[PDB]
């Protein structure tokens, strides 16, 4: 009558987690840490299938964060260390954003010392005593400084995460997807689109734009501590620079280990600053405000500057040609032809929020200028029922993973079970 | 069609073009990674595990007597207690996902039966 029949190739999938690799179309990503390849990609559109998605527990972002940290560490380790720099620095006025400091170091011969001098930003300097003229670097008691490695480039490049054999990626193509819920238009792929691992705070930069209109997403809107990601459809133009003409000196601190520092500054004292197109910014603030009014009832929405705190979390942060800019955005998010914001810069950068590791970025010789697109915002709701009329939002940083969720929220990883059994009229074998 | 193109199609349609899904299981990345990387070891782990899974599935197919058959036909009667639904209903108004979910409890035992059946057949093939 009815007999069993086994089928190989049955299209059924489970939810699963795996080690996804990456691919790219000197630089750490391009020539290390995953393969260079980009053949004709295979994208297909499934029919009559609905798939559930929730971006707020997805192992893609954890894997990407771990890979980014590991790659940066592996890049930093195989070159110069800065243990002899942690000495007493005699600092004086430049003769206002820097200080001229002289200090004693070793040389090519261990029985001889040398006197050298360099310019240092005061954000990289800590005093030793109130009634004294002694100074040291920030991370000389809490970590060990490693110099950013001059021949390698810390420039983001597009990267594609790719699934191994026996796995697949499902992509939600539904317009205006907020990351949680069913998906009625699903596609299958093997490799994600171009993802640029850019690290920034308070302003998402160089990202893919929303398809139709602004998308607002958070893990829990009712909670206030959680970050709110805003994904715009119109990119904003932000171009900015350190214009001061610098010159870097090479200091021999040992047998072949050279330490580069700000040898001198020439020209007029000009401050590093960021320009943003003002009219586009006003338009995008209006669009974000009236879009976010939907999720928050009839209560009015106000924007205010970031609360006081550490420079890393309070100020917007980014990197340009290796120079680390901390910009005070106290006028961008101040609401209810060009807008200019101040930008300090820092050399001893202690990112990844770990301890015992810190990096020193040598200054580029000439001035630095670079242009980019603001493609998203990270906003934080202020807690407390101070008023029942207006709800005020602030710039917000927090976990670095939020910088990548906006690019990885369409994707799901699924395992394939190819073996099935079914009854059929076939008997003979 | 393409890989997993027939997910929404009923089982009768999915019986065609199983070869795309079968062939996708072994396609890989010809390039590899340079030395002294945990990334390289993770990649090696992943692909060795993939090979092991494929080999396990193929061996399980072979023990049942379907060494090189995608749609083979065994000789085990289908107990109605497993899933008692009409042939037309099963092959015309149901996807493979719903089917695999609805007979999840009785899968394991079914496998054992297949084993025994083939073994019996093999023994008879030497006693006849």
């Amino acid at each position, epitope marked *: 009558n009815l007999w069993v029949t086994v089928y190989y190739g049955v299209p059924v999938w*489970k*939810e699963a987690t795996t080690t996804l690799f990456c691919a790219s179309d000197h630089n750490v990503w391009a020539t290390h840490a995953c393969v260079p390849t980009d053949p004709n990609p295979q994208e297909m559109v499934l029919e009559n299938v*609905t798939e*559930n998605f*929730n971006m*707020w527990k997805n192992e893609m972002v954890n894997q990407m964060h771990e890979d980014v940290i590991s790659l940066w560490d592996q890049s930093l380790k195989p070159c110069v260390k800065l243990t002899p720099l942690c000495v007493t620095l005699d600092c004086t006025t430049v003769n206002q954003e820097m200080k001229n400091c002289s200090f004693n170091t070793t040389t090519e011969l261990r029985d001889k010392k040398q006197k050298v001098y360099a310019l240092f930003y005061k954000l990289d300097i800590v005093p030793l005593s109130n009634n004294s003229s002694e100074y040291r670097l920030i991370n000389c008691n809490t970590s060990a400084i490693t110099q950013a490695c001059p021949k390698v480039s810390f420039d983001p490049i597009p990267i594609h995460y790719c699934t191994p054999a026996g796995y697949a990626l499902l992509k939600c193509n539904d317009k205006r997807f907020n990351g*949680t*819920g*069913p998906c009625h238009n699903v596609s299958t792929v093997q490799c994600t689109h171009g993802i640029k691992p850019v690290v920034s705070t308070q302003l998402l930069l160089n990202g893919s734009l929303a398809e139709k209109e602004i998308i607002v997403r958070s*893990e*829990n*809107l*009712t909670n206030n501590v959680k970050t709110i990601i805003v994904h715009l459809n119109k990119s904003v133009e932000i171009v900015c620079t350190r214009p001061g003409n610098n010159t870097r000196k090479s200091i021999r601190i040992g047998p072949g280990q050279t330490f580069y520092a700000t040898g001198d500054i020439i020209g007029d004292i000009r401050q590093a600053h960021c320009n943003i197109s003002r009219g586009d910014w006003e338009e995008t603030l209006h669009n974000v405000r009236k879009n976010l009014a939907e*999720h*928050f*009832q009839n*209560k009015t929405i106000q924007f205010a500057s970031s609360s006081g705190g550490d420079l890393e979390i309070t100020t917007h942060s980014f990197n340009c040609r290796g120079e680390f800019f901390y910009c005070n955005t106290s006028g961008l998010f101040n609401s209810t032809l060009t807008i200019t914001i101040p930008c300090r810069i820092k050399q001893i950068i202690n990112m990844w929020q770990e301890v015992g590791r810190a990096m020193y970025a040598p200054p580029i010789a000439g001035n630095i200028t670079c242009k980019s697109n603001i493609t998203g915002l990270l906003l934080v*709701r202020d807690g407390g029922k101070e008023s029942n009329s207006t*709800e005020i939002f602030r710039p917000g940083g927090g976990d670095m993973r939020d910088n990548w969720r906006s690019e990885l929220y369409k994707y799901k990883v699924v395992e394939i079970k190819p073996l099935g059994v079914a009854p059929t009229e076939c008997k003979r074998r | 069609l393409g890989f997993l193109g027939v997910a929404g199609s009923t089982m009768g349609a999915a019986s065609v073009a199983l070869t795309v899904q079968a062939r996708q299981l072994l396609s890989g990345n010809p390039d590899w990674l340079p030395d002294m990387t945990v990334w390289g070891i993770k990649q090696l782990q992943t692909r060795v595990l993939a090979i092991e899974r494929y080999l396990k599935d193929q061996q399980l197919l072979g023990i049942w007597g379907c060494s090189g058959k995608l749609i083979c036909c065994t000789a085990v009667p289908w107990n109605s*207690s*497993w*899933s*008692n*639904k009409s042939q037309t209903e099963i092959w015309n108004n149901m996807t493979w*996902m*719903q089917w695999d*979910e*609805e*007979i*999840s*409890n009785y899968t394991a035992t079914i496998y054992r039966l297949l084993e025994v059946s083939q073994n019996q057949q093999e023994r008879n093939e030497k006693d006849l």
Partner: antibody, heavy 130, light 107 residues
Framework: QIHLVQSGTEVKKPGSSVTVSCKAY?????????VNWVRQAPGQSLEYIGQ??????????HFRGRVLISAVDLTGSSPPISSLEIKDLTSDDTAVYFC??????????????????????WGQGTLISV | DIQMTQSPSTLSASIGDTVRISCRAS???????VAWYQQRPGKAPRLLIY???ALLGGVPSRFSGSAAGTDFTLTIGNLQAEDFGTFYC?????????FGQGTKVEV
């Protein structure tokens, strides 16, 4: 972690409409989480009033055209909300109504089928008399 | 529609005893697809078992379920300390679902 807060007891003269509210504390959204309304009268027979699932609302045959089930997603000042509305009430509708929420993300867990499902979380129920 | 009938209607019990409640369906249920619930007087129902014989978390390990072709049996073994109230058998094979009449346990 998951709680369901329901409206208060309210008794009405027969011949009017009634609304009942269910408030899901801890539910991220009504995607991945289906809401099912059930009834329990004296006689201790649990019935099935209706559901909202995948933003589609449906009711059983005994109540088609009689009950409207609505839902609003997570907002800033209010967790997800669901609501029963009975247009007309006879003498036999006196009962305690229960709101239930069930996770629908796994797609392989045994707690749900494509349309009919068990009830993982139960509210405290609203008593209605006529 | 799919009906069910539970048995026994009511049973006495005692601390440390093992009890069994069997619900039979009007149609053989291919998958397990049956659930067991508790309900104390004046409280809300609590899901005990789903998928025929799957045990949730927090519920004690003493409960167990057996799924035959048509008859489903809930085994509450080693009734410890506090006794229980009303037990319920529910099917979710076809739409709409249906609950059983119910059984009561007493000391």
């Amino acid at each position: 972690q998951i709680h369901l807060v329901q409206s208060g007891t309210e008794v009405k003269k027969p011949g009017s409409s009634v609304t009942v509210s269910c408030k899901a504390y801890g539910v991220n959204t009504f995607g991945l989480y289906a809401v099912n309304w059930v009834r329990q009268a004296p006689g201790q027979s649990l019935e099935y009033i209706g559901q909202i699932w995948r933003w589609k609302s449906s009711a059983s045959h005994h109540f088609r055209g009689r009950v409207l089930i609505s839902a609003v997603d997570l907002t800033g000042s209010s967790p997800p909300i669901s609501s029963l509305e009975i247009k007309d009430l006879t003498s036999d509708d006196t009962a305690v109504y229960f709101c239930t929420t069930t996770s629908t993300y796994d797609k392989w867990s045994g707690l749900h089928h494509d349309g009919v499902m068990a009830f993982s979380s139960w509210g405290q129920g609203t008593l209605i008399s006529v | 529609d799919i009906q069910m009938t539970q048995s026994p209607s009511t049973l006495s019990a005692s601390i440390g005893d093992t009890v069994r409640i069997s619900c039979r369906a009007s149609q053989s249920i291919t998958g397990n697809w049956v659930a067991w619930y508790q309900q104390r007087p004046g409280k809300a129902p609590r899901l005990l078992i789903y998928r025929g014989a799957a045990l949730l978390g927090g519920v004690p390990s003493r409960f167990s379920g057996s799924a035959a072709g048509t008859d489903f049996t809930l085994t509450i073994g080693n009734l410890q300390a506090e006794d229980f109230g009303t037990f319920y058998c529910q099917q979710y094979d076809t739409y709409p679902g249906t609950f059983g009449q119910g059984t009561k346990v007493e000391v």
